From Swiss-Prot:
Induction note: Expressed late in the viral replication.
Subcellular location: Host cytoplasm
Protein EC: 3.2.1.17
Catalytic activity: Hydrolysis of (1->4)-beta-linkages between N-acetylmuramic acid and N-acetyl-D-glucosamine residues in a peptidoglycan and between N-acetyl-D-glucosamine residues in chitodextrins
InterPro entries assigned to the protein according to its UniProt record, in alphabetical order: Endolysin_T4_type (IPR034690), Glyco_hydro_24 (IPR002196), Lysozyme-like_dom_sf (IPR023346), Lysozyme_dom_sf (IPR023347), Phage_lysozyme-like (IPR052619), T4-type_lysozyme (IPR001165)
Originating organism: Enterobacteria phage T4 (Bacteriophage T4)
Protein name stated in the entry: Endolysin
Keyword Hydrolase: yes
Cellular component GO terms, alphabetical: host cell cytoplasm
Catalytic machinery residues: E11, D20
Length: 162
C-alpha cells in the first residue's frame, strides 16, 4: 500500500463528471472541478484541466494524470503550511499517508484548523488523537472513510485498507 492506492480506494475512479459526497462536480479519482451548481461551469473547468474539449468524459490515463497532480499539490500544500509541516515531518511514512489523505479530501486550510488533533499527533498520543479526529463534521459525514483514515493515524499500519 501507498498513498495512490489508498486514495484510489477512498475516492474511486469515475470517467464521467459526477457529484462528490458534498454534491460538487468532480471527475476521475476525486478531482474536484468546481463548487458551482452549473454543469457547464464544471465542463469548462474540465476542458481547461485536460487541455481539450472533453464533453464531460475523460480517459483513465487522463484521470491518473489529474490524480498525480492533485497528490503532488496536496503534499506541497502541507510542506508550505506553517501549521501542517512540523506535524507532517514528525510522522512516520504510513501516518504521513493518512495526513495526505485528509488534506486531499478536506483541503489544506480545513486540516490546518484541526488544532487539537494536530498537537496530539505531533505528541504521538495516538489513541487520544484518534478520539479527537472523530469529533468532527468530517467523521460524521463520511464515517466509513474517516474510520479507515483514523485507524491509519492510530496504528501506523495499513490494517484498515487490507
Amino acid at each position: 500500500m501507498n498513498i495512490f492506492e489508498m486514495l484510489r480506494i477512498d475516492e474511486g475512479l469515475r470517467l464521467k463528471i459526477y457529484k462528490d459526497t458534498e454534491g460538487y462536480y468532480t471527475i476521475g479519482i476525486g478531482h474536484l472541478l468546481t463548487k458551482s451548481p452549473s454543469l457547464n461551469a464544471a465542463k469548462s473547468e474540465l476542458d481547461k484541466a485536460i487541455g481539450r474539449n472533453c464533453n464531460g468524459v475523460i480517459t483513465k490515463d487522463e484521470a491518473e494524470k489529474l490524480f498525480n497532480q492533485d497528490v503532488d499539490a496536496a503534499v506541497r500544500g502541507i510542506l508550505r503550511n506553517a501549521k501542517l509541516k512540523p506535524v507532517y515531518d514528525s510522522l512516520d511514512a504510513v501516518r504521513r499517508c493518512a495526513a495526505i489523505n485528509q488534506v486531499f479530501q478536506m483541503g489544506e486550510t480545513g486540516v490546518a484548523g484541526f488544532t487539537n488533533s494536530l498537537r496530539m499527533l505531533q505528541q504521538k498520543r495516538w489513541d487520544e488523537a484518534a478520539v479527537n479526529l472523530a469529533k468532527s463534521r468530517w467523521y460524521n459525514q463520511t464515517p466509513n472513510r474517516a474510520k479507515r483514515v483514523i485507524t491509519t493515524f492510530r496504528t501506523g499500519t495499513w490494517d484498515a485498507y487490507k
